[PDB]
Design a protein around this ligand. Structure first.
Ligand SMILES: CCCCCCCCCCO
Ligand SMILES: CCCCCCCCCCO
Lengths: 154, 144
């Protein structure tokens, strides 16, 4: 994304849809990139604090992770994915944000459609599918408002 | 629809369902790999992960007055609709139990044209999960 301002993505978000290059990255509730974003917190240094939910050890756990700015705009590095990358594809800031993440990387990618509100946004999902046409995705999940308002989308 | 021309070997290239839980996980109830269609009515031979093993199953899809519509006789009759086929390359179907649809192909290879017809056929439908498999998976056992 040309000209990302992370100061305009601060707030609460929902994981409306997910897609991955490998079925195993998302297939089960405990799959490793089956993560539900809840909050983006930009820091004055230009990093991104991310609150998310992940199902592990048979419960819905809260995680704080740090996404570090890099020399490539809209690209961040995560400690928690073995210094592998988050790529922001697109955002209108006010409604949706499309990102991809490398599995803990060259070879496996999971992407999500984030929305500010727990509602189905077909405009957001259209842009998501448009930007995925390029990518070899083999699994796609779309979630309903009940899931979005739940804990770990259940 | 000529059940005789659909006879023979098939591969489940892609699957989509209305509810994530129908397809999500190897053990999900509608995660089924079609292997062969035999006219008798349509006998369906398939593989399914059940109880941590790749099991073979045979189900009977009973003819109806509508050539493309079959009813799986089971405790609960499930309707099968053959949406489209060219007999030689691909066959698209949906099964109602909630909705699961598949793109079958005649060889264990990616047919992007067959996948395009699949996605186009599914645009109306409220699908929340979609899986597509690779040659290695297709040639394997329960797409492992
Ligand atoms: C800009 C928003 C990107 C969210 C990154 C999510 C990364 C999750 C890492 C998995 O433990
Ligand atoms: C025309 C072939 C029909 C096969 C039915 C198998 C059961 C449905 C599986 C849905 O993923």
């Amino acid at each position: 994304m040309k000209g990302l301002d992370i100061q305009k993505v601060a707030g609460t978000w929902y994981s409306l849809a997910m897609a991955a290059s490998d079925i195993s990255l998302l297939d089960a509730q405990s799959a490793p990139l089956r993560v539900y974003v809840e909050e983006l917190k930009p820091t004055p240094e230009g990093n991104l604090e991310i609150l998310l939910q992940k199902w592990e050890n048979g419960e819905c756990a809260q995680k704080k992770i740090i996404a570090e700015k890099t020399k490539i705009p809209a690209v961040f590095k995560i400690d928690a994915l073995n210094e592998n990358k988050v790529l922001v594809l697109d955002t209108d800031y006010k409604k949706y944000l499309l990102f991809c993440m490398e599995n803990s990387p060259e070879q496996s990618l999971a992407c999500q459609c984030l929305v500010r509100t727990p509602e189905v946004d077909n405009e957001a999902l259209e842009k998501f599918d448009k930007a995925l046409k390029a990518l070899p995705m083999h699994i796609r999940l779309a979630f309903n408002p009940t899931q979005l308002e739940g804990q770990c989308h259940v």
